[PDB]
Amino acid sequence: SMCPKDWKLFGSHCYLVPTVFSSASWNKSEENCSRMGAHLVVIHSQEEQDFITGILDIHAAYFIGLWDTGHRQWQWVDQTPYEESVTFWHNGEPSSDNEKCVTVYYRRNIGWGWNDISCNLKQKSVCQMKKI
Amino acid sequence: SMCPKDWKLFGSHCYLVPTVFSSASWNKSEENCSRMGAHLVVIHSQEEQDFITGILDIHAAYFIGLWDTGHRQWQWVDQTPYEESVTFWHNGEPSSDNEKCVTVYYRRNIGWGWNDISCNLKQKSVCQMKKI
Ligand SMILES: [Ca+2]
Ligand SMILES: [Ca+2]
Structure with missing residues (x-):
């Protein structure tokens, strides 16, 4: 239907956690998403953050x-606008100008957040693509 | 039947000003269009500019x-080419490298233009989709 087999529908998009694909670098993760005609997730809303997590x-x-294109100059892989006011950074994050990529993880008794x-x-x- | 209920036909496309949410950011505006199998209007002619306005x-x-993906690098949401020679910018627009998203609005005694x-x-x- 609207999503390829085992992909999960939310809004206009289809989502997948590539499970078998062993852990990888940010670039290799993006490259693997693109092998599926997808991108690393672009999280624009509370709904998307809630759904993906x-x-x-x-x-x-x-x-x-x-990813950080300069000095805390955050850019989505699809180049759609970054809005600092609709982000989900953990407390104390971002933390270092040497950390240029972003992960989402769960903190005990807090919930999901970016690092x-x-x-x-x-x-x-986790990868996303548009439906059909 | 060439356009869904409440949509308006022009050439090979159907157009709609959404009503269910009364205003939103660029990203949310694009997601709302996409959820109807549409996108924010892509304007390729004077006739389109005039019909939409x-x-x-x-x-x-x-x-x-x-929207601007880089430094004044304008892109359409449907990846069709941007052509500077066929645009509808207001006088003095685009005004600033800090303003990355584009609106159409009416200037008293001038007419409609992009900002x-x-x-x-x-x-x-405004959302747009291919007709049925
Ligand atoms: Ca960190
Ligand atoms: Ca402006």
Whole structure:
């Protein structure tokens, strides 16, 4: 139908956690999403943050398609506008101008939130594409 | 039957000013269009500019599917080419490298034209889709 097999529908998009694809760098995660005709997730709303985290394992951290093009100059992989006022950074994040890639992970007794980390650290990931 | 109920036909497209939400940011405006299998209007001619502005309230500003991905690098939401020679900018627009999203609005005694504004500001919107 609107989404490929095992992809999950929310809004105009289809989402997948590539499970078998072993942990990888941010670039290799993006490259794997694009092999499926998808991108790392672009999280524009509370609804999208809530939906995407709804399909993740609380014991794992996941690359999202947000990266720092300069000095806290955050850009989505699809180049759609970054709005600092509709973000989900954990308390104390972002933390370091040396951390240029973004992960989403669960903090005990807090919930899901973004963390800036090294682009070279291997993490799980989640992909999105438009439906049909 | 060439357009869904409440939509308006022009050439090979159907147009709608959404009503269910009364204003929203550029990203949310685009997602709302996409959920109807549409996108923010992509304007490729004088005739399109005139038809789209014809169905608008002169007292309101409306997001269109044009935004700056870099430094004055304008892109359409449907990836069709941007052509500087066929644009409808108001005098003195685009005004600033801080305004990455595009609205159409009516200037008293001048007429309709495009204006670059902050992507986070809430505006009305116009959606477009291929006819049936
Ligand atoms: Ca950090
Ligand atoms: Ca402007």
